[PDB]
C-alpha cells in the first residue's frame, strides 16, 4: 500500500557494477585450474 521508489540512478549504477564484475570474472576464468594456459 506504499513504499514508492522515485530513484533509478543507484539501481543502474549497481547493475553496471555487477556487469563489470561478471565480465572481469569471465575474463579471468581462463587462467584457473591445473589444465590452464598462460596469458601474454
Amino acid at each position: 500500500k506504499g513504499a514508492y521508489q522515485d530513484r533509478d540512478k543507484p539501481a543502474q549504477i549497481r547493475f553496471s557494477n555487477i556487469s563489470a564484475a561478471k565480465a572481469v570474472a569471465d575474463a579471468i576464468r581462463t587462467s584457473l585450474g591445473p589444465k590452464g594456459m598462460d596469458k601474454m
Binding site: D6, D8, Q12, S16
Partner: protein, 521 residues
C-alpha cells in the same frame, strides 16, 4: 546506462527523474511567463521577430503569445496545443487554465517528492474534478424569458470581458456597441457576418457602429454617385470575356470579313446578355468578377451603378444586409427577387472613400469601424472586440450565467475540501493540492492587482464557509463585496471547459515517463 550501444548517434533519452524534472521546469516556466497578464490590472508584452518581415505586435491574450513564442519543450508544446484548442473552442480563458495546469503540476511535483504513487493522485484529482463539476451546475442562474434582465446580464458580461484588456478606458461605449452588434444577428451564430475595418487616424473615442453597411470598393466611370430608392441585385457571372464554353471551338476561316462578323456577333451577344441582366428592372448591379470596358459603358449609359471586386464574404454580407439572392443565368425575373435600400452615398473616412449603404430592411450583418494611432493598439482592440463578441455569442447560446470574480473557484475548492474531509486514504492529499491550486488563482489576481492577497483569500474562504457563498473580490478598492451588487458576471460553459481541459492536461502530463528523442534533421 548499458555499455552496449542501442540508439543511434545523436539521440538522448531521459528516464524518470530527469524527464519529470525537465517537464516540471518547463511547466513552471510556461506558467510564470504568462502569470504577469492574468489579473484585471495586468500589463501588455512585446512579441518582436526577426525571421519574418520585422513584425511587431502587442497583445494581452495568452494563447496568441504562446503561439507566437514557439516553444520547444514537449510539455510546453502540449500546453500550447491545449491553449489553442481552448481558444478555438470559446476563446475567453487560456491564461487561467494554463495557470491552473501549472499550479497542478507544481503540486504534483511536491506530491511525487513525498513518495506518493501517481495513480492515487490521478484518482484524487478525478474525484475532485467530478465534485467540482457536480457542485458547479447547482450554482447557475437560468434566464431567457425575461429580456430586461437578459439585456442587463449581457451588458455586464460584455463589460467584465472588456475590462480585462486595453478597452478599460472606453468600456462605457464599446460594451454598448458590442451589445448592439450582437442583437443584430437575430440569434445566428455566424461570426463571419461582422466585418471589422481598422483605419489609421482617430483614437478610440472616434469609433462607432454603422447602422447600415460600408464597402471599401470603387464604382465605374460615368456612373451616378448617389442613388435614392435603389434595388441592389447580387449576381454571379463572367462579364469579362464571356468564354465559359469548355469546347474546342476555334475559328478556322479564310477571310477577315468572317472574323469581323464573328466579333460583331460576340458583341451583339454581350449586349443581349447585358440587356437581359437589366431586364429585371434594377438600377444597382453588383458582380463578383471584373468588369471590362464594354459592360461598364453599357451599364453607365442607362444609369445603373456597377460595383466591381466582390468576394464571397462581401456577397454574403450584402445578401444578409439587404435580402437579395445570388442570381445568375437571367431568364426568369420572377424567381430572382431583389433587395431594399433608400439611401446610397459615398463617405470619406480619413483619406479614403467608402460607399455607405443606409436605409436597409433586414440587417442581419453589420460593420464596425475601428480607429487607432498605432497598428499594435488597433490589433489589440480588434482582438478584444472579437473575444467579446465570441463570449457574448457563447453566453447567449448557453442561456445561463454564473457569477464570476472568483466565487466559482471558491465554491469548487470548498466542495473539494468537504469531499476530502469524509474519505481517508492517500487520496486526501490530491484533493488538498487541487483545492490549493484552485484557491491560488484569486491569490495571483490580488498579487497582480496590488493588495494583500493572503488576507483577502482567507476572508473570502471564511465567508464562503460561514455562508456568504456569493461574494467575490472588489478590484476598485481592495475589499470584500457581493458580486450581485457590483455587476461582475462570467459564464458556465467556458469555466466548465476550462476546468475539464486543465484536469485532462494534468492527468496526461502526470503519467509521463521515458522521453525518447529521435535524431534531429
Amino acid at each position: 546506462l548499458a555499455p552496449v550501444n542501442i540508439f543511434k548517434a545523436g539521440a538522448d533519452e531521459e528516464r524518470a527523474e530527469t524527464a519529470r524534472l525537465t517537464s516540471f521546469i518547463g511547466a513552471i516556466a510556461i506558467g510564470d511567463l504568462v502569470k504577469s497578464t492574468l489579473g484585471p490590472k495586468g500589463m501588455d508584452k512585446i512579441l518582436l521577430s526577426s525571421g519574418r518581415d520585422a513584425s511587431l505586435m502587442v497583445t494581452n491574450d495568452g494563447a496568441t503569445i504562446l503561439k507566437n513564442i514557439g516553444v520547444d519543450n514537449p510539455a510546453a508544446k502540449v500546453l500550447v496545443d491545449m491553449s489553442r484548442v481552448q481558444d478555438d473552442e470559446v476563446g475567453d480563458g487560456t491564461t487561467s487554465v494554463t495557470v491552473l495546469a501549472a499550479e497542478l503540476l507544481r503540486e504534483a511535483e511536491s506530491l511525487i517528492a513525498k513518495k506518493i504513487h501517481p495513480q492515487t493522485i490521478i484518482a484524487g484529482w478525478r474525484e475532485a474534478t467530478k465534485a467540482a463539476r457536480e457542485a458547479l451546475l447547482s450554482s447557475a442562474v437560468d434566464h431567457g424569458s425575461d429580456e430586461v434582465k437578459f439585456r442587463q446580464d449581457l451588458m455586464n458580461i460584455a463589460g467584465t470581458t472588456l475590462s480585462s484588456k486595453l478597452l478599460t478606458h472606453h468600456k462605457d461605449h464599446f460594451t454598448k456597441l458590442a451589445v448592439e452588434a450582437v442583437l443584430r444577428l437575430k440569434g445566428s451564430g455566424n461570426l463571419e457576418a461582422i466585418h471589422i475595418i481598422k483605419k489609421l487616424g482617430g483614437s478610440l473615442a472616434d469609433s462607432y457602429l454603422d447602422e447600415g453597411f460600408l464597402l471599401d470598393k470603387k464604382i465605374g466611370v460615368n456612373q451616378p454617385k448617389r442613388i435614392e430608392n435603389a434595388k441592389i441585385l447580387i449576381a454571379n457571372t463572367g462579364m469579362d470575356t464571356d468564354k465559359i464554353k469548355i469546347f474546342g471551338s476555334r475559328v478556322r476561316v479564310d477571310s477577315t470579313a468572317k472574323v469581323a462578323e464573328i466579333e460583331h456577333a460576340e458583341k451583339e451577344k454581350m449586349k443581349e446578355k447585358v440587356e437581359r441582366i437589366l431586364k429585371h428592372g434594377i438600377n444597382c448591379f453588383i458582380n463578383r468578377q471584373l468588369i471590362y470596358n464594354y459592360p461598364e459603358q453599357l451599364f453607365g449609359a442607362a444609369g445603373v451603378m456597377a460595383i466591381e471586386h466582390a468576394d464571397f464574404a462581401g456577397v454574403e454580407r450584402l445578401a444578409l444586409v439587404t435580402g437579395g439572392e445570388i442570381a445568375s443565368t437571367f431568364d426568369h425575373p420572377e424567381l430572382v427577387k431583389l433587395g431594399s435600400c433608400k439611401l446610397i452615398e459615398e463617405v470619406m473616412i480619413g483619406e479614403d472613400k467608402l460607399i455607405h449603404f443606409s436605409g436597409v430592411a433586414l440587417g442581419e450583418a453589420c460593420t464596425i469601424v475601428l480607429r487607432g494611432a498605432t497598428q499594435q493598439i488597433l490589433d489589440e482592440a480588434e482582438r478584444s472586440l472579437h473575444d467579446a463578441l465570441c463570449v457574448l455569442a457563447q453566453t447567449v447560446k448557453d442561456s445561463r450565467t454564473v457569477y464570476g470574480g472568483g466565487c466559482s473557484e471558491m465554491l469548487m475548492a470548498h466542495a473539494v475540501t468537504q469531499l476530502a474531509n469524509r474519505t481517508p486514504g492517500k487520496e486526501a492529499v490530491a484533493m488538498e493540492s487541487y483545492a490549493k491550486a484552485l484557491r491560488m488563482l484569486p491569490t495571483i489576481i490580488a498579487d497582480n492587482a496590488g493588495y494583500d492577497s493572503a488576507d483577502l483569500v482567507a476572508q473570502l474562504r471564511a465567508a464562503h464557509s460561514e455562508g456568504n457563498t456569493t461574494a467575490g473580490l472588489d478590484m476598485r478598492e481592495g475589499t470584500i463585496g457581493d458580486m450581485a451588487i457590483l455587476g461582475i458576471t462570467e459564464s458556465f460553459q467556458v469555466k466548465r471547459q476550462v476546468l475539464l481541459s486543465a484536469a485532462e492536461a494534468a492527468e496526461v502530463i502526470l503519467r509521463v515517463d521515458n522521453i525518447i528523442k529521435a535524431a534531429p534533421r
